[PDB]
Amino acid sequence: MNPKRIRALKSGKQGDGPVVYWMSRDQRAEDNWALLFSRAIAKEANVPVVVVFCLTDEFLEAGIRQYEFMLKGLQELEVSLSRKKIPSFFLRGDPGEKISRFVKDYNAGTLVTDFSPLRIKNQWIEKVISGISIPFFEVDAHNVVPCWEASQKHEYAAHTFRPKLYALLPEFLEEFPELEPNSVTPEVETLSDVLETGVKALLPERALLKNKDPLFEPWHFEPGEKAAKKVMESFIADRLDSYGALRNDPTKNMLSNLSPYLHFGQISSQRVVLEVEKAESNPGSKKAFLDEILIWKEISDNFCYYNPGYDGFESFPSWAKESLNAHRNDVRSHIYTLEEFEAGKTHDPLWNASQMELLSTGKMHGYTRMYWAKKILEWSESPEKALEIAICLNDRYELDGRDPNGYAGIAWSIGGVHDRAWGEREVTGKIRYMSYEGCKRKFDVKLYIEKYS
């Protein structure tokens, strides 16, 4: 167990009660460095380990699609942990108040959480630190290389971050030890009831079409740790060989489809990398996929961790801010409202089809995601307005949304973060431009449009 994966958030006097794993980002029982570290500390203190999850008040800012996907996975997780004699407690409310009250009530000895660089997690940590007196640790269970270890600062390009991460792969890319069960079972409602009341509160804002029927199709991605593994095995067996050649074709389902599972932590990216590394397939396709799940995924954590304003115009590179400022008063070809973007009511049938794939499946193809967000910049009054629209639609309708990959991917599309300058155009400036005709020369756009009416 590498001690570089864990960071001390607050020192204190250890109690003689159970070690509490405040699970948040990595919702799985296998391949969880945060849970394994909590079990190790619990063994050293001759005390059990308990898992606590907070059902926050911000779930009404998303949809049923993300709520059901997460809760149905937690229902499976509660059974997995129970077989390991590890009890799980699901609290409903503010983590600042609920975690502090749980620590005091259950006489917790040590508190551990997983790592997320998002602003809301730091808000919770701030509130929790003020209300506890026991040691508080956080463990990076999401990245193969701990975020604070891969680089000590913001990396402006993938080619500067790539050698740093690969140089540390031999140390941190390793197999997971088995989660040892608790010795004996130790000493706040049913998840089915919380799901029922939550869905009932979300129903008025459910995405519907004109026929009052729901837009979202839940059968595309089955939630849970077991289903995530089957998706990974199917990708390695059937799709990895062609990934390098077809990853930019939205008419082919050749991606791994792992992001909903990766976002909620229902599968470990380190586990996926281990299995891909030992798989025998096209070297170009393996290089391409590993570049996505290692370099681009973990550089997104790098971006949010080292840029407090990661969701703002101020985090854009200087060349992009100056370029976009120089074209602020350029006349835009079209100006669409947030409601027109949301309903897919633009003059662009390819953009509208991309929005329909997002509305119906909750996972837009990676290539059209780049086109989808760049057109928001082109058809908005300002770069700041384009950021708000793209973030709003991304976090509301993507299953993989509200994620460092989302803010870093949007910042790449609109602000050229982790990109270079291109030819100077009006409105968009030197930001990389993606044209409708350019897409037509890349893939069968007519089939993609016809698929998502």
Ligand X SMILES: Cc1cc2nc3c(=O)[nH]c(=O)nc-3n(C[C@H](O)[C@H](O)[C@H](O)COP(=O)(O)OP(=O)(O)OC[C@H]3O[C@@H](n4cnc5c(N)ncnc54)[C@H](O)[C@@H]3O)c2cc1C
Residues placed in the known binding site for FAD: 243, 256-259, 292, 363, 369, 394, 400, 405
- What gap in Å lies between CA 80 and CA 326, rounded to an integer? 56
Compute the least distance from the CB of residue 414 to ligand X, in Å.
8
**What strands, in cross-sheet order, belong to the sheet with 88-92?**
6-10, 136-139, 110-114, 19-23, 49-55, 88-92
Strands 110-114 and 88-92: unpaired
- What gap in Å lies between CA 256 and CA 261, rounded to an integer? 11
Among 134, 403, 428, 439, which residue sits at the site for ligand X (rule: CB under 6 A)?
403
Structure tokens at 220: 């595309």
Among 255, 411, 434, 445, which residue sits at the site for ligand X (rule: CB under 6 A)?
255
Compute the least distance from the CB of residue 413 to ligand X, in Å.
5
- What gap in Å lies between CA 239 and CA 295, rounded to an integer? 20
Applying CB under 6 A, which part among 145-153, 154-162, 255-263, 445-453 lies near ligand X?
255-263
Per-residue DSSP letters for 430-450? TSPP--HHHHHTTS-HHHHHH
Binding mask 375-394 for ligand X (x = CB under 6 A): -------------------x
Structure tokens at 32: 């969880």
Binding mask 278-317 for ligand X (x = CB under 6 A): --------------xx--xx--x-----------------
The reply on whether position 87 binds ligand X by CB under 6 A is: no
Place of tokens 């990959």: 405
Binding mask 210-249 for ligand X (x = CB under 6 A): -------------------------------------x--
SS percent in the chain: helix, strand, coil, step 5: 55, 10, 40
Would you say 48 and 16 are in contact if contact means Cβ atoms under 8 Å apart?
A: no
- What gap in Å lies between CA 119 and CA 391, rounded to an integer? 14
The reply on whether position 366 binds ligand X by CB under 6 A is: yes
Between 39 and 263, CB nearer to ligand X: 263
Between 134 and 373, CB nearer to ligand X: 373
Compute the least distance from the CB of residue 258 to ligand X, in Å.
4
Between 126 and 291, CB nearer to ligand X: 291
Q: By Cβ distance, which residue is nearest to ligand X?
A: 409
The reply on whether position 93 binds ligand X by CB under 6 A is: no
- Helix (H), strand (E) counts: the chain: 21, 6
Per-residue DSSP letters for 263-318? HHTSS-HHHHHHHHHTS-S-HHHHHHHHIIIIIIHHHHHHHHHH-TTTTSGGGS-H
- Footprint of ligand X on residues 155-184 (CB under 6 A)? none
- Site residues, ligand X (CB under 6 A): 247, 255-259, 262-263, 292-293, 296-297, 300, 366, 369-370, 373, 394, 398, 400-401, 403, 405-406, 409-410, 412-413
